[PDB]
Amino acid sequence: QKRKLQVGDKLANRHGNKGVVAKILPVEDMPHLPDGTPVDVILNPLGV
Amino acid sequence: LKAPVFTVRTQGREYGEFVLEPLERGFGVTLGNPLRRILLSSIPGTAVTSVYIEDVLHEFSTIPGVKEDVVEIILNLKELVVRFLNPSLQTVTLLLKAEGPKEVKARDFLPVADVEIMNPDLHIATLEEGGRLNMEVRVDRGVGYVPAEKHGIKDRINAIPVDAVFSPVRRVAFQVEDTRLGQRTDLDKLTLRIWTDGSVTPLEALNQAVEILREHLTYFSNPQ
Amino acid sequence: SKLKAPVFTVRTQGREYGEFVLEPLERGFGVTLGNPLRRILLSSIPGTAVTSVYIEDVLHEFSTIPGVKEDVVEIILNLKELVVRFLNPSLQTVTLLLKAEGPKEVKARDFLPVADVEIMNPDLHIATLEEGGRLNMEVRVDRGVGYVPAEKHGIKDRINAIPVDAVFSPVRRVAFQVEDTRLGQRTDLDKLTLRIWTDGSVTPLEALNQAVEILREHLTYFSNPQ
Amino acid sequence: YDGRTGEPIEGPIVVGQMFIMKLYHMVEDKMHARSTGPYSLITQQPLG
Amino acid sequence: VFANPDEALLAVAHGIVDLQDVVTVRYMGKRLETSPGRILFARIVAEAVEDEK
Ligand SMILES: [Mg+2]
Numbered sequence: 001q002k003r004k005l006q007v008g009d010k011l012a013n014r015h016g017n018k019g020v021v022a023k024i025l026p027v028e029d030m031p032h033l034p035d036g037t038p039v040d041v042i043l044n045p046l047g048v
Numbered sequence: 049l050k051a052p053v054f055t056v057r058t059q060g061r062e063y064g065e066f067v068l069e070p071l072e073r074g075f076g077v078t079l080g081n082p083l084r085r086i087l088l089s090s091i092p093g094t095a096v097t098s099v100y101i102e103d104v105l106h107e108f109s110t111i112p113g114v115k116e117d118v119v120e121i122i123l124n125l126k127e128l129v130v131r132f133l134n135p136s137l138q139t140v141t142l143l144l145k146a147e148g149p150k151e152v153k154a155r156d157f158l159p160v161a162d163v164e165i166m167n168p169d170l171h172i173a174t175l176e177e178g179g180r181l182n183m184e185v186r187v188d189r190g191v192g193y194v195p196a197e198k199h200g201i202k203d204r205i206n207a208i209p210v211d212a213v214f215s216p217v218r219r220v221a222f223q224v225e226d227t228r229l230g231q232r233t234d235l236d237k238l239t240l241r242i243w244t245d246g247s248v249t250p251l252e253a254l255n256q257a258v259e260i261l262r263e264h265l266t267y268f269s270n271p272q
Numbered sequence: 273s274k275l276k277a278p279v280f281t282v283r284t285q286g287r288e289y290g291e292f293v294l295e296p297l298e299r300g301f302g303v304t305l306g307n308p309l310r311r312i313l314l315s316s317i318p319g320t321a322v323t324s325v326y327i328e329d330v331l332h333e334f335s336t337i338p339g340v341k342e343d344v345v346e347i348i349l350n351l352k353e354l355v356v357r358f359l360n361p362s363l364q365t366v367t368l369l370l371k372a373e374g375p376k377e378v379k380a381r382d383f384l385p386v387a388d389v390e391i392m393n394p395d396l397h398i399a400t401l402e403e404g405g406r407l408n409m410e411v412r413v414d415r416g417v418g419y420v421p422a423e424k425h426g427i428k429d430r431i432n433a434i435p436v437d438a439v440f441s442p443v444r445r446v447a448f449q450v451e452d453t454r455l456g457q458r459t460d461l462d463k464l465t466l467r468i469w470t471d472g473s474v475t476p477l478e479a480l481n482q483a484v485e486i487l488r489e490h491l492t493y494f495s496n497p498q
Numbered sequence: 499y500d501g502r503t504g505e506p507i508e509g510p511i512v513v514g515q516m517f518i519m520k521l522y523h524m525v526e527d528k529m530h531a532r533s534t535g536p537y538s539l540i541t542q543q544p545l546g
Numbered sequence: 547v548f549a550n551p552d553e554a555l556l557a558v559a560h561g562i563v564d565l566q567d568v569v570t571v572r573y574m575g576k577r578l579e580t581s582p583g584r585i586l587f588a589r590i591v592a593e594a595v596e597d598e599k
Pocket residue numbers: 093094095213214215216
């Protein structure tokens with residue numbers, strides 16, 4: 001089977017920050033740069 | 049405030065700038081944002097939906113004489129841009145027959161009436177001598193993003209469904225500048241920037257988005 | 273497989289509050305429609321407001337008058353609560369005259385009547401006078417939209433007149449809500465609720481109809497390039 | 499900019515590029531439910 | 547100087563003042579000297595319990 005990312009999957013970086021995916025948003029809902037480029041991931045600053 | 053002037057600047061069939069000025073204070077965001085939301089989500093286009101390759105049973109296999117596997121080949125077919133010249137056309141099937149050694153591009157598809165390929169130089173596969181590729185690609189017309197699990201379209205037994213990304217719009221941004229008219233000084237100047245794939249022009253996409261918003265405004269008419 | 277047309281229901285009590293519901297909608301269209309209408313409702317609905325006041329024997333805004341409980345600030349704050357409707361479409365600005373003698377309570381109905389001008393809240397309290405109290409006041413009322421501070425327009429009809437903040441907008445508050453709904457096998461649909469507060473000069477249903485027409489008119493400007 | 503409203507966030511936000519991994523623990527392999535089923539030999543209690 | 551919480555919050559929507567700026571607002575018959583955001587917090591509690599006093 002071919003598995004795509006879904007709500008409940010676990011992600012991490014190399015510095016020990018981990019968490020499960022809780023929400024998937026359509027592209028027009030994401031924050032974007034003034035040139036129209038949207039971001040991919042939103043991380044909480046309260047974990048730092 | 050007097051009716052604004054509309055200006056259009058276009059670069060080919062893929063980029064365009066649309067300017068509306070002067071506007072009242074705050075109306076640039078009021079008009080710009082809803083158009084951007086509609087443009088990025090509700091504009092119809094075309095996408096590859098199902099592929100059949102001769103002597104291939106599923107997508108987790110390889111083909112003798114071909115450098116790429118079926119998964120990589122399908123990833124290349126999701127970048128194909130097909131333009132229907134007839135508004136009544138809903139589905140077409142493109143045929144390809146090749147023998148190595150050669151690099152097969154999107155221009156190797158057989159010609160079809162009222163169908164145009166917008167990126168003929170798109171690489172598809174690399175054939176070594178002794179390799180063959182005989183495939184049929186089905187292109188549908190639709191709106192939005194539809195995973196292969198939802199439609200499950202197969203024209204024959206061994207066909208492989210493909211995830212469809214129908215939207216022809218690539219990127220949208222809008223600018224708000226500070227203009228003035230005589231004594232009034234806090235007026236807005238609005239510019240819309242639209243990027244498309246070429247099957248639909250930015251001016252065509254803008255007109256279709258304005259009609260979608262106008263249609264929705266009639267829903268506030270009859271209170272039940 | 274396009275979605276069916278949604279249903280528009282209303283729940284209005286009195287002339288100052290109403291709730292409006294539209295469902296079902298496509299995914300993300302509750303935000304697409306709620307935000308523009310909210311911005312238009314708070315800045316574009318025509319209305320009337322007080323722009324200047326002249327009081328006899330009063331120099332500046334921070335003083336106090338002998339013989340009346342209220343100071344100059346409180347009287348001005350009460351004038352900003354006054355709701356007045358023009359009955360003449362050509363009428364642009366009017367002045368209201370008030371003369372009072374203590375020890376009565378001055379009300380909004382104590383203003384001298386003006387033709388084609390109506391007071392919507394005649395029971396509004398203005399000031400309280402005592403024995404030996406005088407109040408000679410002149411109030412100027414204009415037409416406009418939005419909210420304009422006093423120091424911006426700076427309107428003074430005569431000498432020693434005090435400009436006041438102009439609360440033109442009849443709409444007092446807007447709040448909209450978006451909820452997830454379902455229709456058979458479709459589960460990402462939208463339901464939009466729109467709640468409007470008004471001062472009574474225009475009904476909340478009237479304000480919504482005007483806001484929709486303003487947005488529709490601006491959409492026809494994408495018509496004739498250059 | 500906010501995609502839902504078109505208005506900016508009130509303060510500048512830290513934006514950049516980061517390397518993120520998808521871990522072996524997926525919700526697809528972990529969700530389970532039961533009404534009735536096999537029982538133990540001696541204690542006659544449900545299995546685990 | 548604002549006559550009620552609605553006027554102060556309408557000025558915020560027009561960008562005249564911020565929620566952290568200290569102003570004069572009339573509320574519940576008293577002339578308070580606070581920010582619009584503290585007046586906003588008071589309305590959150592009042593509507594949740596449906597008893598202003
Ligand atoms: Mg595409």
